[PDB]
């Protein structure tokens, strides 16, 4: 019918967007930050070495209480660790041993996990029976789950490999909203502190900002040469840093709609697995496939320090809600807490 | 330590949980894990039935050995970004239908998939068990259509024992790491009740090789 006209309109929309983005690019973040003093050498020690897992560690999450953390391994069991005493709180035997993500609810009543099974497993930690049981199974996805996060309103935003992100209502077990637009497989989500907006990363080398209510992608970011692996929000929620298999992390600002600064090093060719921010946001921590975790100055990218307390891939990384300590998990079945 | 607060029952529960975790890990390690591939292009369902909405797990015990198989038929996602999660499987069962040579042909797609998984770095040391299912159908079909339709470079007789041997040799030739990786090719049919024996022999050989590495002889 008018496919040629549609494609021409799309191309000139892309041109207009590029022109608008370039018009406001008066200067880069590097020039503005030239006068800021360096963060210096950031050195941390492995205060704790949590052990008990007998398989690869893939995901972990920090509870709002700053003490309890949950880790998911391929043994099919979730262990909640008391970081202050390297003590195990509960052991949750999972129906499926192929997990890929886990999350800790801010309220602390529920813990969620999932993976290749395509089913969300919601476990109730606080119950009168003591034993941990599955509350609801949020079935409906047509692909492997990659990341799940708990909204402050006791809701789960699910990321799956079928290119769809869904907002599930726990008590009804139904998809409240369906999100589409990513041509590639979705890997990581991150919700802002206010829970108003959140961004999703996919294998199409693009990051899309989805408003949980309007059902629309407010903004889209692109430029990466390979798949996206992890995304995290700046404490403000006005910017986010995304990792990619191309061994480069970059910072994007929602109010700028353009790349701010790129993190890369000649000696680093391994890809990134997880990315997290410090409470102040000055330090950017991201795990790499080179069996080590690197600390980057979010403002200048000086590579302030590096962590090498691991023997295999660093699969999961998470900063405490208060920024007191950083947890680094790896496929070696050991979790290291840094501070 | 002994200087902790009165809540030492928490440490006792932690030790009990550690004991349970160790027992579960020992049980998991004792069991054999196998990966099944070829869904959507081969008679995988027939092999699964002989052994008898995402990954499917099948449990069966043979000759006092516990077998645990995973079906990844949900191939509607980027394989390279989740295949690595299976690093550690004892062996990989790859299913091919010999009747797909004439039906780019589907046999070429199966060959490309095998090359993709055979050469994957995550499966460098994991042996592959190859089953050529629907052998009778291919035997009947070869008498009507020459094998040259799928392999123009092929030259030889149209007899079953020749074409089957040629294709069996062709599949192995794609292995670029023959030194550290072995391929166990077998012919499978719906009426072949001894297919379990082939898998048992393959897993026994894999366990023998692992024991040889552990003892230093490999």
């Amino acid at each position, epitope marked *: 019918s008018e496919l040629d006209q549609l494609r021409q309109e799309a191309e000139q929309l892309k041109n207009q967007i590029r022109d608008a983005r370039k018009a406001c690019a008066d200067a880069t973040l590097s020039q503005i930050t030239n006068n800021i003093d360096p963060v210096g050498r950031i050195q941390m020690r492995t205060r704790r070495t949590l052990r008990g897992h007998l398989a690869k560690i893939y995901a972990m999450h920090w509870g709002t209480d700053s*003490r*309890l953390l949950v880790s998911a391994s391929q043994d099919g069991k979730l262990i909640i660790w*008391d970081s202050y005493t390297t*003590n195990k*709180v*509960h052991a949750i035997p999972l129906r499926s041993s192929w997990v890929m993500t886990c999350a800790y609810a801010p309220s*602390g009543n529920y813990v969620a996990c999932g993976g290749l099974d395509n089913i969300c497993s919601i476990y109730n930690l606080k119950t*009168r*029976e*003591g*034993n941990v049981r599955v509350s609801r199974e949020l079935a409906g996805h047509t692909g492997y789950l990659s990341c799940c996060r708990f909204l402050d309103d006791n809701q789960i935003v699910t990321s799956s490999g079928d290119t769809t992100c869904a907002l599930w209502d726990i008590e009804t077990g139904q998809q409240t909203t369906t999100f589409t637009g990513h041509t590639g497989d979705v890997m990581s989500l991150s919700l802002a502190p206010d829970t108003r907006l959140f961004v999703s990363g996919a294998c199409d080398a693009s990051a899309k900002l989805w408003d949980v209510r309007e059902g629309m992608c407010r903004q889209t970011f692109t430029g990466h040469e390979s798949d996206i692996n992890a995304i995290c929000f700046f404490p403000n929620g006005n910017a986010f840093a995304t990792g990619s298999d191309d061994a480069t992390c970059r910072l994007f600002d929602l109010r700028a709609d353009q790349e701010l600064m790129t993190y890369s090093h000649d000696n680093i060719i391994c890809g990134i697995t997880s990315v997290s921010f410090s409470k102040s946001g000055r330090l950017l921590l991201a795990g790499y496939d080179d069996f080590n975790c690197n600390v980057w100055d979010a403002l200048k990218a000086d590579r302030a320090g590096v962590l090498a307390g691991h023997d295999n891939r660093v699969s999961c990384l998470g900063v405490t809600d208060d920024g007191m300590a950083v947890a680094t998990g790896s496929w070696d079945s050991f979790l290291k807490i840094w501070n | 330590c002994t200087l902790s*607060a*009165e*809540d*030492k*029952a*928490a440490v*006792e*529960r932690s030790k*009990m949980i550690d004991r349970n975790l160790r027992e579960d890990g020992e049980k998991a390690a004792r069991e054999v894990k196998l990966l099944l591939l070829g869904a959507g292009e081969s008679g995988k369902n027939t092999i699964v039935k002989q052994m008898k909405t995402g990954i499917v797990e099948t449990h069966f015990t043979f000759k006092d050995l516990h077998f645990k198989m995973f079906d990844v038929g949900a191939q509607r996602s980027e394989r390279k970004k989740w295949i690595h999660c299976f690093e550690g499987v004892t062996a990989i069962i790859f299913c091919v239908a010999l009747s797909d040579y004439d039906l780019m042909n589907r046999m070429h797609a199966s060959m490309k998939l095998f090359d993709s998984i055979c050469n994957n770095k995550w499966f460098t040391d994991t042996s592959i068990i190859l089953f050529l299912n629907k052998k009778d159908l291919f035997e009947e079909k070869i008498k009507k259509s020459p094998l040259t339709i799928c392999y123009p470079e092929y030259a030889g007789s149209n007899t079953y024992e020749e074409a089957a041997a040629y294709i069996q040799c062709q599949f192995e030739d794609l292995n670029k790491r023959k030194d550290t990786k072995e391929i166990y090719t077998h012919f499978t049919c719906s009426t072949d009740t001894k297919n379990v024996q082939f898998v048992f022999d393959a897993v026994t050989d894999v366990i023998i090789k692992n024991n040889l590495k552990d003892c230093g002889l490999f």
Partner: single-chain antibody
Amino acid sequence: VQLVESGGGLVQPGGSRKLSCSASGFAFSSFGMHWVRQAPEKGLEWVAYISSGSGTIYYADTVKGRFTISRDDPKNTLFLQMTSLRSEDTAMYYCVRSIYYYGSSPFDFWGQGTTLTVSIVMTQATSSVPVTPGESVSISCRSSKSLLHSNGNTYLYWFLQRPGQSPQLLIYRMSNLASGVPDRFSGSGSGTAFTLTISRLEAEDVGVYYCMQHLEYPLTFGAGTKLEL
């Protein structure tokens, strides 16, 4: 969750008895158990404790050796081997669950108990305090040692024993509201002086308030204060 005890009745002094308790819909394997006496003088006391898997067992100096606490996880039952009975042993026996981990609320359920008839110091300033519906009441108790452990927990437990009913937990380890109770209950303390307050009294808040420490064994129980309408 339900706990039922059995094995009561009259017993001659110096005899033997094997009290038993059974639970249903109860993860007995992962749950600990406590035995506490309730003498006719309304003074609660601690008898024995058995941890999960029978790993650790403790007895009070008043019941040492004579009592042998045993559990059978497959049967989900708890047993007491009682020998050398005396007159002072005449008291109601309660089975109390307990779980120990971060954020835990031990002693959250008390059994109906059974009656057996034989042929750190806690003090309460007020033996009783008259009250009326809708009135605000404040109760305080004192301890012989500072319960503020270095871990940052006051280890203060509060219970209510309504007439004819088993005690019910109110607070756990710091002013923390128990599950299933209204929000009108609150508490505070400094380490040696502890207080419990109720914003608005209701008809269901009539009974005896009990205070017990958990800093070190044996678990010593308070005398208790009775609330009169």
